[PDB]
Amino acid sequence: KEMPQPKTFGELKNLPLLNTDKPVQALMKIADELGEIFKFEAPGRVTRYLSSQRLIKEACDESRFDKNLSQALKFVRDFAGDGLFTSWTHEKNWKKAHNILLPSFSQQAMKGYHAMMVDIAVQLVQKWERLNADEHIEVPEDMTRLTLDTIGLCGFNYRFNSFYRDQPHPFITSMVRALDEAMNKLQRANPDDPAYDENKRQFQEDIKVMNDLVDKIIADRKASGEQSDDLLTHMLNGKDPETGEPLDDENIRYQIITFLIAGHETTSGLLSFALYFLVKNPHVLQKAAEEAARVLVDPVPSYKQVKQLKYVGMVLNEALRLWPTAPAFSLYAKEDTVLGGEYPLEKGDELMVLIPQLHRDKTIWGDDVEEFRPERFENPSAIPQHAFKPFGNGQRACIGQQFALHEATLVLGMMLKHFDFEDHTNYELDIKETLTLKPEGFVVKAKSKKIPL
C-alpha cells in the first residue's frame, strides 16, 4: 500500500501547509481528501496522520506505540520541563510524578475539590446575574476566568481573582506569550534570521518570569508549614510507592506550570463549545435545562447532585466528539511493525492521531456524524474501544479527565439552572488554535430565571 501525501513545495516538502493560524483544521481537510492515513514530510522529518478507528485502535496498543513529543511539545518543554505533559514515558520523573499525583486526580478526590469549584462557579453566576439589560457575555473570556481560578484554588490555594480584573496576572501574560511563541515556531522555515532575535529575547524573559514566580509559591508554602488539601501539599508530602522518593522542588515547579497551562487552555474550550452547541440546538438546550432544574434543587449544588446530571454529561461528551479541545497526540513505533496489515513502520517512526477525524468515522458513528446528538452517549457500554479518545490513550491519557468533567458538569449545570441563553448575533463558528481549540468571539445574552443562590 502506497500512502497518500498532500501537495508539496519543492525542497520544503509539506512544511508550508502548516503556515496557517488554523493547522489542525487544515489537516482535517487533508484527511477528508486523502482518507484514513497520509504521509507528511518536512525538511529532516516525516510523520503519518491517522483518522480511522481501524488504524487508531492499533496505534493505541501500548505494547507497540508510546507517546512522542511532537515539535510543538518540544518547544513547550522549554518552559513546562519534565512535567507530566512534556516528559517521555522513559524519564524517571514521568512515572514518579504519575504515581504520586494519580490519587490527587481520582473521582474520589473530586469530593475534596467540590467546595472550591462551587466558590468559583458561584462567582461566575453572580457576575452574569449582575449584568444590565442588553449587555452580553464574552463566553471563552469568562470560561477562562473560571477555569484559571479553579486550578489556582484547587492547585495551590491561590486566588487569581480573574472576575475582579480585565488585565491578566503577570504569570499569565508571560505564559500566553510563551505558548504563542512555541506555536509560532512550528511554521518558521528560517529560525536563525536576526528578524526573530526579539522573539528569542522575549521568550527567555517569559521563561524566567514563570520560573521565578512559581519557585516563590513553593518556597512560601515550605516557609508557612500550611497543609491545605491541594496539589502543592500532595507534591511536598507524597512519596512514589515505586522508588520511595518524593518529587524535587524543580520538578514540582514544572508540574505547577503544567497544571496552570492546562487550567487556562482546556476545560474553558469544552465549556465554550458546549454552550455554542446548546444555543445552536434549542431542543437539546431544553433537555439539559430541564435536567438542571429537576436535579439542582438546592441553592449550592452538592457532589452527588453533579453526579446525577447524566444529560449534562452527555452534552459535554458530544461537544468533545465534534471538537475535542486537545485535538491531536503523537506516537512512535517501539519496534518495527506493520500498521493495519498494509503500512510497514521502522522502530522510531512517528504517527499523529487526528482526534476530530476519529470522532467523524462513519463506520463507527453512522452517517449523521456532523449532527449534535448527546443521545449517542446514553449508554457508555455501546461506544467501542478506542472510538472516542478526547483524553488521549492508556498510561499517558489525561490525568485531569475527572477534574475537567466535574468542573464542566457543575458549571454548565448551574448556568442552565440560572439563565435562559440567546445567540443574539447568530454567531458564525470561528475556531482559534493554540495547543487547544476555542470558539473565538463567541458571545451570548443571558436572561436570569431569578432563582436565588
Ligand X SMILES: N[C@H]1CCCc2ccccc21
Decide: is 266 part of the binding site for ligand X (CB under 6 A): yes
* Least Cβ distance, residue 83 to ligand X (angstroms): 7
User: What are phi and psi for residue 372, nearest 5 degrees?
Assistant: -90, 100
Read off the C-alpha cell for 230: 491541594
By the 8 A CB rule, do 350 and 41 touch?
A: no
By the 8 A CB rule, do 225 and 48 touch?
A: no
Choose the one of ligand HEM, ligand ZP6, ligand X, none that binds residue 261, judging by a C-beta under 5 to 8 angstroms depending on kind.
ligand X
CA neighbor of 157 nearest in space, from 226, 91, 225 = 226
Q: In 130-196, which residue ranges form alpha helices assigned H by DSSP?
A: 139-156, 170-184
In this chain, which stretch among 67-75, 92-100, 281-289, 374-382 interacts with ligand ZP6, using CB under 6 A? 67-75
* Least Cβ distance, residue 116 to ligand ZP6 (angstroms): 26
Decide whether 72 or 124 has the Cβ nearer to ligand X. 72
In this chain, which stretch among 114-122, 197-205, 238-246, 257-265 interacts with ligand X, using CB under 6 A? 257-265
Rounded distance, CA 287 to CA 291, Å?
6
Rounded distance, CA 305 to CA 281, Å?
25
Rounded distance, CA 401 to CA 105, Å?
8
Residues 310-329 that bind ligand X (CB under 6 A): 326
**Binding track over 161-200 against ligand HEM, x by CB under 6 A:** ----------------------------------------
Residue 398 bears catalytic tag: yes
Q: Which residue(s) pair with 443 in the sheet?
A: 138
Decide: is 436 part of the binding site for ligand X (CB under 6 A): yes
CA neighbor of 24 nearest in space, from 262, 186, 140 = 186
In this chain, which stretch among 6-14, 135-143, 320-328, 332-340 interacts with ligand HEM, using CB under 6 A? 320-328
CB-side neighbour CA atoms (13 Å) of 246? 11
Decide whether 13 or 317 has the Cβ nearer to ligand HEM. 317
Q: 13 in the Ramachandran plot: left (φ > 0), alpha (ψ -120 to 50) or beta?
A: left
Candidates 28, 38, 40, 203; binder of ligand ZP6 (CB under 6 A) is 40
**Binding track over 67-86 against ligand X, x by CB under 6 A:** ------------------x-
**Binding track over 393-432 against ligand X, x by CB under 6 A:** -----x-x--------------------------------
By the 8 A CB rule, do 316 and 412 touch?
A: yes
* Least Cβ distance, residue 281 to ligand ZP6 (angstroms): 27
Choose the one of ligand ZP6, ligand HEM, ligand X, none that binds residue 265, judging by a C-beta under 5 to 8 angstroms depending on kind.
ligand X
* Least Cβ distance, residue 47 to ligand X (angstroms): 18
Read off the C-alpha cell for 187: 511554521
Task: Please report where in the chains the cell 456532523 appears, as a residue.
Answer: 370
* Least Cβ distance, residue 355 to ligand HEM (angstroms): 7
Q: Which of 40, 156, 325, 398 is catalytic?
A: 398
Rounded distance, CA 28 to CA 82, Å?
30
User: What are phi and psi for residue 255, nearest 5 degrees?
Assistant: -70, -45
Distances (CA, A) of 277 to 144, 281, 367, 430: 18, 6, 19, 13
In this chain, which stretch among 38-46, 244-252, 319-327, 439-447 interacts with ligand HEM, using CB under 6 A? 319-327
Decide: is 26 part of the binding site for ligand ZP6 (CB under 6 A): no
**Residues touching ligand X, count (CB under 6 A):** 11
* Least Cβ distance, residue 159 to ligand HEM (angstroms): 17
Q: Which of 391, 403, 419, 421 is catalytic?
A: 391
Rounded distance, CA 180 to CA 200, Å?
12
User: H or E element: which one contains 296?
Assistant: none
User: H or E element: which one contains 262?
Assistant: helix 249-265
Q: Is 60 annotated as a binding residue?
A: no
Residue 171 bears catalytic tag: no
Residue 60 bears catalytic tag: no
In this chain, which stretch among 40-48, 165-173, 204-212, 340-348 interacts with ligand ZP6, using CB under 6 A? 40-48
**Ordered strands of the 350-354 beta sheet:** 37-42, 45-50, 350-354, 328-333, 65-67
CA neighbor of 257 nearest in space, from 222, 226, 213, 219 = 213
Choose the one of ligand ZP6, ligand X, ligand HEM, none that binds residue 159, judging by a C-beta under 5 to 8 angstroms depending on kind.
none
Residues 402-431 that bind ligand HEM (CB under 6 A): 403-404
Rounded distance, CA 186 to CA 314, Å?
35
Query: By the criterion CB under 6 A, which residues form the site for ligand HEM?
Result: 67, 84-85, 98, 151, 258-259, 262-263, 266-267, 270, 324-326, 329, 390-392, 396, 398-400, 403-404
Residues assigned a catalytic role:
266, 391, 398
Query: By the criterion CB under 6 A, which residues form the site for ligand ZP6?
Result: 18, 23-24, 40, 42, 45, 47, 70-73, 186, 326, 328-330, 352, 435
